[PDB]
Design a protein around this nucleic acid. Structure first.
Ligand SMILES: [Mg+2]
Ligand SMILES: [Mg+2]
Ligand SMILES: [Mg+2]
Ligand SMILES: [Mg+2]
Lengths: 102, 67, 118, 233, 57
RNA sequence: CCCGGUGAGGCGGGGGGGCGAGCCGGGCUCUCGCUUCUGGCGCCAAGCGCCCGGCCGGCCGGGCGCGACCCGCUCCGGGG
RNA sequence: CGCCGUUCCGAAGGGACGGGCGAUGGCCUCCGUUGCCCUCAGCCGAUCGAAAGGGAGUCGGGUUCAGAUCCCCGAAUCCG
């Protein structure tokens, strides 16, 4: 016999993901001192459609606690969050929709 | 005649002393690259009876091969 | 004294310039694209004559490796004239043709007689 | 007189607030692989169980004994290349118109001298690597009754013999004026090393957990002790 | 104009005579001055009560 | 030995300070480490202490420390 | 022979306004250049990949047997 279609999927080739127009990987913040002890504030800049994904993605912006920079995070958009909203991530963030807590 | 004691010592590979040295050295050798220039022979007596001489032009290389 | 950065980077170390004990080549190689090499011979076709008479232009076959700056400097030195610009094409047979235009104070028709073209 | 314009502008370094200062991150640096390797090897020698044959070398002379031992040895350094030429030339003129005592260097030369009982004092560097070169010498010297000591630094014994490094040196003879100094050093060295040999060779090393682990165990017990102490109050 | 054509234009053609001019609209520049001022005032209001409450405490 | 994260950025222990508890003003039980209203701003030190230099006590110009606690052996976690 | 792999087990920067020490020079006046030191420094991936994608800036008239937005005449423009 010959190799069946299921076998051929694992070799990549014409069976790889179509990631040309995706907006990046949707992740939480990288845990640091701020989230280990207190909280950090962030503002929701945009909610965007991600090709190939049913859920929208939120583009949250934080202040870098060690440098003069803005960090852009690509979160999964919890239902009910809006642009211009403040979200807070950390151990002492308050139990509100869109906040990131342990 | 230290090369005589070392030779006998490296025959007791299951002794507590040599087991400790082989174990930590294997660990250290495992954190390096599969080919690595060694500054000097780890076994000066074994090296020399295989022809090694402690003079310029002789070099040592440690090679890691999968078992 | 202290490290304000969690990164470790290779420190900059002195880099000496080369000081060879001997030169690898005993003598420099002679220039093989001098002025006499660049200009092979002048073109004498019907259209080259038109260039001389109407456009104050000399037409030369030149080394394919030569560039416009080289052609211009070679033309001036060989025939002691001034050059306004140079246009170049590579012919279908592989030769490079140079359309050299002379300064207005020069007469290509006169210069051609000096060269022997006319 | 103080300018009224000048003022304090303190920075608040709480979570949020102002950017953090450029403090010392030495502890959290990502070091090159070779640095991580030699440091993790020093932690293993503490963490693991080091046999007494290898661990005997952690016991060494104090600075004050090593200074005396090194000052006496400084008086018997082998003649350098330059000053041997002078000695040879001085012999040439001597021809036309004894061997003083000197240190014996090298694990191979010292081993033969110890076996022959021709050595009076053996000094062994503590950081020989591979350790197998000298891991047997303390036991050998003890068998032959040759007093031995362990000194900090194969490089210090290196400077004695005008070489980068030296595993071990041995006193074979001393001048009459220096016989008393050797007798004093031998006595102190003999008690610490040759006389305690029975306990030295049973004394394992290492087997010490890291500070965070030790604190974690100490805290866990202190809860029991305080709970035990609160049991009766 | 195209982005590389801005290189040969003078500055006056590329901005406006105002803070953030040529990068932020006037409408939102008015809003940041008010927000920056109004938010800074609330800090003093909060701070005074904190000290005043602490003063009693 | 393995896995995850990070530009390996504050880990462990102790010190020091604030809110409560409580025995007869001090010690402890023991907690906290200064950001939640607004679609702003936020680095490249203020201040203080101590030394040094240039010019004629006055002008000019630097260094160190605190500010920014101390000591530690695995970067931090999760497995093992 | 090589293959996998493309940031993943890497000491991956040969740079910069400024400042300090010398060595040299020139419209030697004072300004350059250079070497070292101090200080500062994310980009985190060598390189290749489109004559239809991105990509500053040329148009009119004349001219040949055969070429012209390329030659000549005239009038412009970008970049350095
Ligand atoms: Mg290319
Ligand atoms: Mg193209
Ligand atoms: Mg194109
Ligand atoms: Mg033109």
């Amino acid at each position: 016999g010959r190799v069946i279609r299921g076998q051929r999927k694992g070799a990549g080739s014409v069976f790889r993901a179509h990631v040309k127009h995706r907006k990046g990987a949707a992740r939480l913040r990288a845990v640091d001192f701020a989230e280990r002890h207190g909280y950090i504030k962030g503002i929701v800049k945009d909610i965007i459609h991600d090709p190939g994904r049913g859920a929208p993605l939120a583009k949250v912006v934080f202040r870098d606690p060690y440098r003069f920079k803005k960090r852009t995070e690509l979160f999964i958009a919890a239902e009910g969050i809006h642009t211009g909203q403040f979200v807070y991530c950390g151990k002492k963030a308050q139990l509100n929709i869109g906040n990131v807590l342990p | 005649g230290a090369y005589k004691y070392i030779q006998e010592l490296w025959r007791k590979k299951q002794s507590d002393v040599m087991r400790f040295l082989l174990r930590v050295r294997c660990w250290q050798y495992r954190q390096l690259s599969a080919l690595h220039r060694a500054p000097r022979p780890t076994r000066p007596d074994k090296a020399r009876r295989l022809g090694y001489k402690a003079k310029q032009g002789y070099v040592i290389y440690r090679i890691r091969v999968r078992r | 004294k202290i490290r304000t950065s969690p990164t470790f980077r290779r420190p900059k170390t002195l880099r000496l310039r080369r000081q060879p004990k001997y030169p690898r080549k005993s003598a420099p190689r002679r220039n093989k694209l001098d002025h006499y090499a660049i200009i092979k011979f002048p073109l004498t076709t019907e259209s080259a004559m038109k260039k001389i008479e109407d456009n104050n232009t000399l037409v030369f076959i030149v080394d394919v490796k030569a560039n416009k700056h080289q052609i211009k400097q070679a033309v001036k030195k060989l025939y002691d004239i001034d050059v306004a610009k140079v246009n170049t094409l590579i012919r279908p047979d592989g030769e490079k043709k140079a359309y050299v235009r002379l300064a207005p104070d020069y007469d290509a028709l006169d210069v051609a007689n000096k060269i022997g073209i006319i | 007189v103080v300018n009224p314009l000048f003022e304090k502008r303190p920075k608040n370094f709480g979570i949020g607030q102002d950017i953090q200062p450029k403090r010392d991150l030495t502890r959290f640096v990502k070091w090159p692989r070779y640095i991580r390797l030699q440091r993790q090897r020093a932690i293993l020698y503490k963490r693991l169980k080091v046999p007494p044959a290898i661990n005997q070398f952690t016991q060494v002379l104090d600075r004050q004994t090593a200074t005396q031992l090194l000052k006496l040895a400084h008086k018997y350094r082998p003649e350098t290349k330059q000053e041997k030429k002078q000695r040879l030339l001085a012999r040439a003129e001597k021809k036309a118109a004894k061997r003083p005592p000197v240190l014996r260097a090298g694990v191979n030369t010292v081993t033969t001298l110890v076996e022959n009982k021709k050595a009076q004092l053996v000094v062994i560097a503590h950081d020989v690597d591979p350790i197998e070169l000298v891991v047997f010498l303390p036991a050998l010297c003890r068998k032959m009754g040759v007093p031995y000591c362990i000194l900090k630094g194969k490089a210090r014994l290196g400077r004695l013999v005008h070489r980068k490094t030296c595993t071990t040196v041995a006193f074979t003879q001393v001048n009459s004026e220096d016989k008393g100094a050797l007798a004093k050093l031998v006595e102190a060295i003999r008690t610490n090393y040759n006389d305690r040999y029975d306990e030295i060779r049973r004394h394992w090393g290492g087997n010490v957990l890291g500070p965070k682990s030790v604190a974690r165990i100490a805290k866990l017990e202190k809860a029991k002790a305080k709970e035990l102490a609160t049991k009766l109050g | 104009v195209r982005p590389k054509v801005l290189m040969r234009l003078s500055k006056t053609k590329k901005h406006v005579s105002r803070a953030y001019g040529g990068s932020m609209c006037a409408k939102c520049v008015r809003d940041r001055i008010k927000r920056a001022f109004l938010i800074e005032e609330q800090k003093i209001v909060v701070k005074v009560l904190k000290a005043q409450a602490q003063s009693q405490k």
